[PDB]
């Protein structure tokens, strides 16, 4: 791997990469950060603690023009796997956690393509506040949310957007949580009915506030009441 | 970012983040302390502890971190990782779990006049003696006592954060309301030492009334 | 700031936190140890563990951390990270399932004379013989043995700060009353 060794030397030792600085030509520009969320598995919804535990893979996509290279000058290399702490990162956190775990769990490698695109898919176990409506229990449905934002950067410095996919040369935003139809194992008590994604911008907040922008992934989940039916309700009613 | 990099190079020259900013010996660092309550997570009566999620609001001045925007491309503000600058050692003294510190250091905002604003998140478990006499038709008085752990009053002077409202800030739209507790009063107070090793405190009080419908139905 | 920055830079130039901080190796590091009890968190009778919130005030003199204030703008005291200097390795000998040593490395207050005061917090989980014969009218006597784990009395001497633990900032418990307290 003499070629990517030379490429890393060219990117970080020859051009003087400073990961503390955002990838912008001027300070007033904002770094566009595209976010998508894949739900690996819904671990649980604890009603007493009012806590949703989820396993999620957070896809980050942004552009760092300092990490560009011509492939045919470096052995036709088109992609690199670099440590995430070797390159500026748009530090997104789960704002509405309720255990103090703001950050992703496994800081995996970033993938950097020759045209300057940085792709990053950290997985994470998240424990988030989900207030519980008990009115129709055990025939209840809940409305949990995973609210992602940046506390280190504000809307002036990064712009959050949804991931954009393509079909037949037509672009569309990914406005839902991604679930693999084959690999996803459904929770034994909760069925996902709706799973939208939204970019929320608060017009009242100033642009230099971390609360100006967020991306929220919502889970509308219906309880499967068979356990409670069989074990509690029929005996109690009879 | 070349201008921002140049400004960072200027600001970090000769700077020791472990040294308190005092231009002259005897100068005190004024630290304004405020609190934003994102969520009242719980009040555990068995363990006698209030679990809260908050954002601190700490403001002070570090004269070393001042600059003239005219000579730095009109840059009037910077965002700098908190570990890179001197921080007041402000902690929750009355924590119940041994955790004194904030949940995430994040970044401070530094203005050209040297004003530093820092709003770290914190998940705190604070000691609250429970008045059990009228449980479950009870109201509690759970305090959050914030103070410098090391610096004394002759080095760091505290004041209540305001812009003057002496209260915990609760954003109406985004606040995660608790299903069992109603916040009646939420003031904040600067507590002076009893009249040199002495330390002030900033105490945020949460007077909360239980909503006892569960016990009416079930008991 | 500038004076203190220069002082802190010069103090740690040839400093070693490995060796004991004495002019001569035949001397003994005199450490004053005072326990402050902030709260009696729990008395677990089944597992015989008493959980307490404490401040472990430790005072000694570092011979090499001295300066003349006149040379540094009159700076007479500073605060420095505790991880940078030699410290006594006090351990709770009868620790049950908590931490054996101090894990919260708070700043030390250093005077120009070399006097160091270090007052870290800790959650002591100590193993205590629990006599349940008279429960719920039972009286307990739970101790906290503290000592330098790796240093003997010929190289480090520990002395109590006071005959009694400091209960000035003790929070009143809703299940226990401290009838007596004493350090030996």
């Amino acid at each position: 791997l003499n070629e990517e060794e030379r490429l890393i030397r060219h990117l970080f030792q020859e051009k003087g990469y400073n990961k503390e600085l955002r990838p912008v030509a001027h300070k007033e520009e904002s770094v566009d950060v595209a976010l998508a969320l894949t739900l690996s598995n819904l671990i649980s919804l604890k009603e007493v603690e009012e806590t949703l535990t989820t396993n999620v893979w957070i896809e980050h996509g942004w552009t760092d023009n300092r990490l560009k290279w011509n492939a045919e000058e470096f052995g036709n290399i088109s992609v690199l796997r670099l440590p995430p702490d070797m390159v500026w990162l748009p530090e997104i956190v789960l704002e509405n956690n309720n255990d103090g775990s703001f950050q992703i769990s496994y800081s995996c490698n970033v993938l950097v393509y020759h045209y300057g695109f940085v792709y990053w898919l950290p997985p994470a176990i998240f424990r988030s506040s989900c207030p519980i409506s008990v009115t129709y229990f055990p025939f209840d449905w809940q409305n949990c949310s995973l609210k992602f934002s940046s506390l280190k950067y504000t809307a002036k410095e990064i712009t959050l957007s949804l991931k954009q996919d393509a079909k037949e040369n037509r672009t569309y935003p990914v406005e839902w949580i991604i679930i693999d139809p084959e690999g996803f194992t459904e929770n034994g008590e909760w069925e996902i009915v709706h799973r939208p994604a939204r970019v929320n911008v608060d017009p009242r907040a100033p642009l230099d506030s971390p609360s100006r922008q967020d991306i929220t992934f919502y889970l509308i989940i219906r309880r499967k009441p068979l356990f409670y039916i069989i074990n509690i309700l029929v005996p109690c009613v009879l | 970012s070349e201008a921002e990099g140049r400004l960072r190079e200027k600001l970090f020259s000769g700077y020791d983040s472990s040294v308190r900013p005092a231009r002259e010996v005897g100068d005190r660092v004024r630290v304004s302390v405020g609190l934003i309550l994102a969520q009242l997570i719980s009040l555990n009566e068995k363990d006698e502890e209030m679990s809260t999620k908050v954002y601190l609001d700490l403001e002070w001045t570090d004269y070393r971190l001042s600059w003239d925007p005219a000579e730095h491309d009109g840059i009037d503000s910077l965002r700098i990782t908190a570990e890179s600058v001197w921080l007041p050692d402000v902690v929750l003294l009355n924590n119940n779990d041994g955790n004194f510190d904030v949940a995430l250091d994040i970044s401070v905002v530094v203005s050209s006049d040297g004003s530093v604003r820092w709003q770290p998140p914190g998940i705190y478990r604070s000691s609250c003696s429970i008045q059990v006499t009228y449980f479950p038709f009870d109201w509690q008085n759970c305090t959050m006592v914030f103070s410098s752990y090391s610096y004394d009053s002759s080095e760091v002077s505290l004041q209540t954060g305001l812009g003057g409202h002496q209260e915990i800030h609760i954003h109406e739209g985004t606040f995660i309301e608790n299903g069992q507790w109603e916040i009646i009063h939420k003031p904040s107070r600067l507590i002076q030492p009893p009249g040199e090793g002495q330390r002030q405190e900033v105490i945020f009080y949460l007077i909360i009334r239980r909503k006892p419908l569960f016990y009416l139905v079930n008991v | 700031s500038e004076h203190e920055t220069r002082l802190v830079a010069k103090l740690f130039k040839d400093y070693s936190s490995v060796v004991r901080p004495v002019e001569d190796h035949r001397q003994v590091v005199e450490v004053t140890v005072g326990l402050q009890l902030i709260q009696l968190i729990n008395v677990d009778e089944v597992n015989q563990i008493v959980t307490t919130n404490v401040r472990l005030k430790q005072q000694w003199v570092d011979y090499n951390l001295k300066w003349n204030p006149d040379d540094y703008g009159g700076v007479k005291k500073i605060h420095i990270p505790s991880e940078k200097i030699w410290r006594p390795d006090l351990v709770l000998y009868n620790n049950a399932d908590g931490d054996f040593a101090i894990v919260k490395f708070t700043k030390v207050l250093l005077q120009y004379t070399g006097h160091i005061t270090w007052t870290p917090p800790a959650i002591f989980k100590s193993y205590c013989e629990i006599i349940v014969t008279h429960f719920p009218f039972d009286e307990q006597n739970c101790s906290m043995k503290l000592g330098t784990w790796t240093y003997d009395g010929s190289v480090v001497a520990i002395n109590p700060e006071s005959d009694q633990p400091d209960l000035s900032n003790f929070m009143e418990s809703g299940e226990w009353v401290i009838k007596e307290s004493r350090g030996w």
Partner: antibody, heavy 124, light 108 residues
Amino acid sequence: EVQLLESGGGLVQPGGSLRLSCAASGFTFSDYAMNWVRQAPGRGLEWVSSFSNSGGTTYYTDSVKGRFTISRDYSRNTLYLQMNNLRAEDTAVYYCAKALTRFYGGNIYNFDFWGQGTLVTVSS
Amino acid sequence: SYELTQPPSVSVAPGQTARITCGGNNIGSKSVHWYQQKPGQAPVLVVYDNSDRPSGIPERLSGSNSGNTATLTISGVEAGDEADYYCQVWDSNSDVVFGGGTKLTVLR
């Protein structure tokens, strides 16, 4: 035992490039600002560059600004100086020097330890 | 361009005292450091902050700073003190400034 071994110096034509390296041992590499100081043959000492972990900042003298790049190895305790567009004025013994402070600058800033250096000769 | 000024050469007999000066505008308000470079050897810090001595440096080397002059004093000149002595300071506008070194010659 503090030790600074410089390498990568040698002969290069004018306008060429060269990467000097300085392997450091015996001290915490991240607790001290690192520096490159050059000495042309028969001439005095001249500070070239400094790298500070405080804020991740780099500093260069004017004559080498835009041409030289100081960096550190991501994993190993190694300091790099990538030099480009080398002139005959850059011929010198380049020493890698450790500072007393983790930060660059301030009145107290001085080089408490020096390596033996590497000779860089720029000639056709 | 703070321009520390040093004398190119200082000559003294064995056993006498050599005084190597470094001139500058209000240098008494700055911290002056002194490095010794033997022939074909790396420089060695011999004084820092105008008077302090690193461990392993002989006590016969001392420093002073006042007004517009800093001084390095080498007493009891031995046969192995031949070296180039450089003064050094830091300035906010000029970065690291070295002086034009002073060669010490023993007058035997």
